Design a binder for this molecule. Structure first.
Ligand SMILES: CSc1cccc(Nc2ncc3cc(-c4c(Cl)cccc4Cl)c(=O)n(C)c3n2)c1
Length: 271
């Protein structure tokens, strides 16, 4: 018995989301509650069923106000379904790039970084690591509400470090040194990515290391190169941005600390 298992009939598929950049995800309707939802689907021919099922499973364990919420699943017979709440404003990257900056202001940017750090602190305590933390994987809802995508989560079964399947490709500009070097990800690797995410938020969606060819990024980081403080970015925040980019992962702060710092900046800023 699985309280989550539901009827594939209850849902009404509509169209694809994010132009496919997230896979087989569509906007749907849950007839019963006339609720608009998000539906991840698995195709006919795939060796994904194993992974697809684990994602769903993981999602039944996580519950945080800033992590996308699972509503139900259809995993008995194909096509498989993972049903989640619907985020009306898409991903945080597009949101920042199109938003009105008089509305989505400094306090708002601060507020969004707090929410994301809040979710990461939850994941950190829960012993999970996120394999793709970036603005493009943060969803936005009304009132600058931000939730981190639950897809791409791995649970640390033993160590505090997760090794990815040898020969896996990850976003260079968001990947911590140790990950690019040895395919090893810890929560500290997420801290690094979070620091990059901060940079995206502070630049209203600019591409990280703009103009710098990928083949050079790792070396530049070795030689101690880091992105400069974005125009308008308060020093306190850049200082935290820089701490997230310590070369040694153990020198990087914990999400508990980062969250704490933001909760404070956010609060004293709203005064
Ligand atoms: C600009 S319009 C636009 C464009 C893209 C996206 C959205 N909204 C949205 N809302 C909710 C989701 C939920 C998921 C999801 C699912 Cl279906 C299963 C497991 C984990 C996650 Cl995070 C998802 O992948 N995506 C892309 C979602 N997207 C709106």
């Amino acid at each position: 018995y699985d309280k989550w298992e539901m009827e594939r009939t209850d849902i009404t598929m509509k169209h694809k989301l994010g132009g496919g950049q997230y896979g087989e995800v569509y906007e749907g309707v849950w007839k019963k509650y006339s609720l608009t939802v998000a539906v991840k689907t698995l195709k006919e021919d795939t060796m994904e069923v194993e992974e697809f099922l684990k994602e769903a499973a993981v999602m039944k364990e996580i519950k945080h106000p800033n992590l996308v919420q699972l509503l139900g699943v259809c995993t008995r017979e194909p096509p498989f379904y993972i049903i989640t709440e619907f985020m009306t404003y898409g991903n945080l990257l597009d949101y920042l790039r199109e938003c009105n900056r008089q509305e989505v202001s400094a306090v708002v940017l601060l507020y969004m970084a707090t929410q994301i750090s809040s979710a990461m602190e939850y994941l950190e305590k829960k012993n999970f690591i996120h394999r793709d933390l970036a603005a493009r994987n943060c969803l936005v809802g009304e009132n600058h509400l931000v939730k981190v995508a639950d897809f791409g989560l791995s649970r640390l079964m033993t160590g505090d470090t997760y090794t990815a399947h040898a020969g896996a490709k990850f976003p260079i500009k968001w990947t911590a040194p140790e990950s690019l070097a040895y395919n090893k990800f810890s929560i500290k690797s997420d801290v690094w990515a979070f620091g990059v995410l901060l940079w995206e938020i502070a630049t209203y969606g600019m591409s990280p290391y703009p103009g710098i060819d990928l083949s050079q990024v790792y070396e530049l980081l070795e030689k101690d190169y880091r992105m400069e403080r974005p125009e308008g970015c308060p020093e306190k925040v850049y200082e935290l941005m820089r701490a997230c980019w310590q070369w040694n992962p153990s020198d990087r702060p914990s999400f508990a600390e980062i969250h704490q710092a933001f909760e404070t900046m956010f609060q004293e800023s709203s005064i």
